[PDB]
Structure formats: C-alpha cells, structure tokens
C-alpha cells in the first residue's frame with residue numbers, strides 16, 4: 001500500500017507540451033474549444049495513455065454496501081433497496097446501466113459490504129454485512145480499510161491490463177450521504193449544517209436529525225483530518241472506501257477516472273489526502289444537486305462540465321460524461337490544421 | 347410566413363403528463379435524474395416526436411455568410427476564412443464536423459451570403475455577396491430577411507420528412523459577433539459595453555472600437571426591439587437570419603432544436619420575438635465564453651447543460667449536446683420500474 005502509493009506516476013509534461021502545440025495548430029482560433037482543449041492536454045499527460053489523448057475500453061465500477069447509520073433514521077429508502085438495486089445492476093435496468101450502454105461502457109458491480117446474502121453475478125469483495133453505525137463508533141477498523149483499498153486498487157489496475165483506459169466510479173448504499181457529509185465536513189472544516197443535504201428525498205423536517213447524527217459521528221470518533229485513511233475508517237463506509245480504492249488504482253495505473261456526484265467527491269477528498277499524486281488523474285463529470293456539493297468541489301478545485309441537477313448516484317453522472325472525454329480525443333485526432341489551409345492568424 | 351407563424355403547434359400537454367408519470371415510476375428516487383427528466387418531458391410534448399421522447403436522425407445546419415462590418419476593424423480573422431472554412435466543412439475536417447460525426451449527426455453547410463465564388467458541395471441559398479455594413483446602414487432589406495426566413499424554414503421542415511428529428515444550429519462568418527452583440531443589446535436593452543465580447547480572439551485594445559461600432563449601428567438604424575424581423579434586417583446578418591429560420595422551421599415542424607453559442611442566442615431572441623410559440627422547441631447546449639452570454643441567456647430564461655468555456659461556433663456546442671438528448675430518451679425507454687422490483691417509497 002505504501003508501495004502502491006509510492007509508485008503513482010507523475011504526469012508526462014513532455015507529452016502535454018506536444019499535445020498543446022498540436023491543439024494550437026488545429027483549424028480554429030487558438031483556445032476556442034476551451035475546456036475541451038484543457039481536457040485533451042490532461043489526458044495526454046497520463047502515462048497509461050501512451051502520450052496522447054485516447055479512449056479504449058470504458059468501465060464504470062459500482063461499489064455497493066450497507067451502513068449501520070441507517071438505523072439513525074437518516075434515510076427514507078428501505079435498507080433492502082441496496083440489495084435489490086445491486087441485483088438490478090446485473091440486469092441492466094438501472095440508471096447507470098442505461099447510461100453506460102449509451103456510452104459504450106461496461107458496468108462492474110462490486111459488493112463491498114451489502115447486508116444481505118450474496119448476489120450471484122456481483123463481484124464479491126464483501127468486508128462485512130454492512131459497516132458500523134458511525135453515530136456511536138467507527139464504521140470499521142483501519143486494517144479493514146487498508147485491505148479493501150488494496151484489494152480494489154488491484155482489481156482496478158488489473159482491468160487496465162484488459163484494454164480499459166477510462167474509469168468511472170459509482171456507489172449504491174442506502175444512508176450513504178450521511179458518512180459522505182461527515183467526511184466532507186472533516187476534510188473541509190465546514191460545519192455539518194452547511195454540507196448536509198436531502199440525499200434521496202429526505203423530508204425537510206428530518207434534516208435536523210441528520211445534522212445531529214453527523215456531528216455526533218465526528219465528536220465520538222474524533223477522526224484526524226490529516227489522515228485520509230483515519231477519516232474513511234471512522235466516519236466513512238465500505239462503499240466510500242471502495243471508490244477511493246478505484247481512484248488510487250487508476251492513478252497507479254496512470255489512467256483517468258471520471259468522478260460522479262456527492263458521494264464521489266467525498267472519496268476524492270480522501271484519496272487526495274492520502275496521495276496528492278492522485279489529483280491529476282481525476283476528471284469531474286457533473287455538478288451534484290446535493291447541498292454540500294459546492295464546498296466539496298471547491299476543496300477539490302474542480303469545476304464540473306455538466307449541470308444537470310442530478311442526484312441519483314450509481315455512477316450515472318460519470319457515464320453521462322464519457323462522451324465528453326471521447327469528444328476531446330476526436331477533436332485532437334480528427335480535426336484539420338490551420339497551416340494546411342494556409343490560414344494565418346495573429 | 348404569417349401562415350408559417352400561425353401554424354406553429356402548441357406542445358402536447360397530454361403526452362407530457364403521460365411522460366411525467368412514466369418517469370416518476372422508474373427505478374430511482376423521484377426527481378433524482380433532475381434536468382434529464384425535465385428534458386424528456388419537454389421532448390414528449392413536441393408533436394413531431396409522436397408523444398414520446400425519441401431521437402431518429404440528427405442534423406446540424408451551418409449558416410455561412412460574410413458581413414460588411416468586417417471593414418470596421420472588428421475582427422482579426424481574415425475575411426476569406428469564411429469561404430475557406432465553408433469548403434473545409436465539405437471535407438469534414440472542421441470542429442463541428444468532427445463533433446457531429448462523434449454524435450452521429452450530419453452536417454449541412456448552407457451558403458446564405460459568403461463573399462466569394464460559389465463553393466461546390468455547399469447548399470446554395472446566397473442572398474448576396476456579404477451583407478451591408480451595419481455601421482452605416484442596414485445589413486439588408488426587410489424583404490430579403492423575410493424571404494430567407496421563409497426559404498430556410500422550408501428547407502428545415504423538409505429534412506423532417508426524411509427522418510430528421512433533432513436539429514442543431516450553427517454559423518460561420520468572420521465579424522459575426524458584432525451584429526450578434528447589437529441584436530442582444532437591442533433585444534435586452536443592455537448597453538453595448540456589457541454585451542460586446544472578444545469574439546475570435548480580438549485584442550483587448552481593439553474592444554473599444556468594437557463597442558463604438560455597435561452603438562453606431564444602433565443609432566443609425568434605429569431598429570425596433572418589438573419587431574424581430576426589423577432588428578434582424580437592420581443590425582443582423584444573413585447567417586443570423588438563417589439560424590432564426592431554422593428555429594422557425596423546426597418549431598413549425600413540431601421538432602426540437604439545439605442552440606449553440608452566442609451567435610445562436612442572438613438568433614433565438616429574434617425568433618422568440620417574432621414567435622413566442624417557438625420557445626418550447628428550443629434546447630440550450632452550452633454556456634458560451636462570450637461576454638454577453640449571461641445576459642442573453644437570462645432573457646431567454648435558459649440554463650445550458652454544458653460549461654466548457656467554448657467559443658468556436660459552427661454549431662460545435664450543439665453537436666456536443668446531442669448525446670445528452672439521446673440520454674434522456676434512453677433513460678425514458680430503457681430503465682426498469684419501481685413497481686416491478688416491489689420497491690415502495692414515500
């Protein structure tokens with residue numbers, strides 16, 4: 001793990017310089033394609049991409065798990081939905097499933113701790129049957145967090161070996177916006193009220209309780225903000241841990257990862273805390289409708305491309321942005337050149 | 347034309363109601379897919395779509411034309427670029443070309459007034475060899491505007507008859523951000539300084555002159571803000587007129603049109619002024635980096651989906667958003683249902 005972290009590659013400045021010059025010479029006013037140009041340069045710098053913006057196979061990894069905090073009344077969805085939806089992921093009837101198919105991406109469903117019997121067809125990496133109730137203690141042990149990080153990381157890099165060049169990250173876990181808010185609060189130093197949202201349609205009345213739960217979780221566990229693994233283990237969840245693991249894995253592999261929504265921002269903060277070297281590999285997708293989104297994104301210094309007021313999760317936002325990534329590549333490779341048209345600008 | 351305007355259909359509220367109920371029953375928390383749901387309902391209301399959100403063939407119409415105002419020193423691009431780029435559109439090496447191919451859309455290049463010899467392969471609807479210099483008089487005659495509107499409108503609806511169900515609108519015309527700013531200024535009642543941008547890399551120094559040119563255009567022509575055709579003819583251009591014509595045509599045909607950037611916002615204001623019934627058919631794509639974008643969008647009451655800091659034009663933003671439209675349809679048609687999973691929410 002320290003090995004893993006040690007070996008994350010830095011971005012290739014040389015490839016990026018070559019990319020930039022190439023972009024500048026395309027059939028358009030310089031810088032006219034804005035963020036699409038910056039994206040292309042970013043990709044070019046990723047070692048697993050072979051010095052150029054390109055997209056081979058795509059995969060969306062969905063981390064599923066239950067949370068003990070559900071018992072605190074922080075979520076209106078029945079606990080069982082996690083298990084139900086996880087099975088549905090195998091049938092391709094879910095939101096991320098539908099959106100991934102549209103993008104030509106494959107969905108990988110991973111059970112990191114669903115509180116139900118095992119689901120056939122789902123990748124089994126179950127830590128336990130749901131994590132500890134963060135309100136009265138830690139979600140899990142540091143050892144448990146570390147091992148899962150390690151395990152997911154490896155699975156991720158392994159896909160790389162099979163042609164995957166672009167990852168998307170997602171989750172499924174009733175009550176998960178609670179640990180996400182706790183993490184955000186801790187990493188950003190924001191007060192709970194500021195970052196706690198309605199999650200999946202939590203009634204306006206029930207909010208106060210959700211805020212109290214987050215505060216309690218923090219007070220009781222005393223997570224250390226300067227220690228990402230400490231935070232994850234104390235006030236996070238298996239699903240959150242798994243997402244962080246994808247990010248660590250893609251970076252080590254020198255490949256890009258598309259973030260999703262709120263839950264993913266939490267995991268990204270953790271990952272960046274654990275290894276800043278991870279940052280350059282992250283790509284935002286959309287701007288989650290969760291209340292704490294703005295704060296979390298500010299701390300990641302990220303500006304999403306899509307404003308869809310989405311708040312479903314599952315990696316649906318990630319899938320939706322994949323075409324944008326492919327667009328930047330298309331632009332890079334298929335546009336003509338100014339010089340070829342004898343076009344001279346100032 | 348008055349016929350044309352008379353016959354624009356209202357949206358089908360019945361289809362929309364059915365759509366909404368269907369969306370609500372999908373495998374997700376109600377309203378969780380945000381703008382993707384609203385988009386789907388919007389499409390369902392469009393009569394040319396047959397009561398459901400669907401996408402058949404797609405086309406991006408690019409209106410090309412030169413402007414006399416170029417002579418005022420408002421643009422750094424050589425005048426000839428219009429003609430050059432128009433030809434390039436036939437070769438598929440341009441930005442919109444590359445992005446359309448990615449979206450599976452076909453690009454239609456239409457010459458409405460390029461100041462050069464005719465370009466083989468380009469649809470010929472040339473009004474004149476460039477429009478009048480708006481700084482000292484009108485861009486064209488009202489008759490000329492009306493006829494072009496009519497002609498483009500028809501061409502548009504005709505494509506419908508060949509399976510096209512989704513349009514994208516774009517332009518190509520050196521100096522065109524000048525008439526666009528004038529129109530915006532006039533329709534919104536904003537001062538020129540507020541809406542005049544750098545267009546295609548206009549040097550910061552040269553801005554003042556661009557602002558003076560817009561003011562002059564307005565003072566001299568005295569366009570009537572309550573008369574969209576009056577504005578277009580006086581301070582617009584052939585390309586701007588053509589874009590408005592696409593919007594009028596798609597609406598009459600009961601089909602959706604994706605807007606592009608700044609230039610397209612100008613045309614949209616005109617179209618809405620001319621026929622408010624057009625509004626429900628318009629779909630924003632991205633948020634142009636042009637200075638006057640925010641003001642123009644506010645007046646259209648639109649919030650784009652994509653924030654890419656793009657400012658190329660050509661309909662590139664339109665092409666880039668097409669996948670989003672297809673996503674809303676995919677969502678609508680391919681997701682499973684709550685009831686089927688025995689999922690009951692509050």
Ligand SMILES: O=C(O)c1cccnc1
Nearest residue numbers: 199261262288311312313
């Ligand atoms: O932004 C998200 O990903 C999200 C928001 C609410 C509930 N679940 C997921």
Ligand SMILES: O=C(O)c1cccnc1
Nearest residue numbers: 545607608634657658659
């Ligand atoms: O927003 C646009 O479409 C645009 C901005 C600048 C120059 N040309 C087009």
Ligand SMILES: Cc1ccc(O)cc1
Nearest residue numbers: 027028029427431660
């Ligand atoms: C130089 C240039 C190229 C393309 C375009 O659409 C405008 C200007």
Ligand SMILES: Cc1ccc(O)cc1
Nearest residue numbers: 081085314373374375
């Ligand atoms: C009810 C539900 C459905 C999907 C999902 O991802 C979350 C909750």
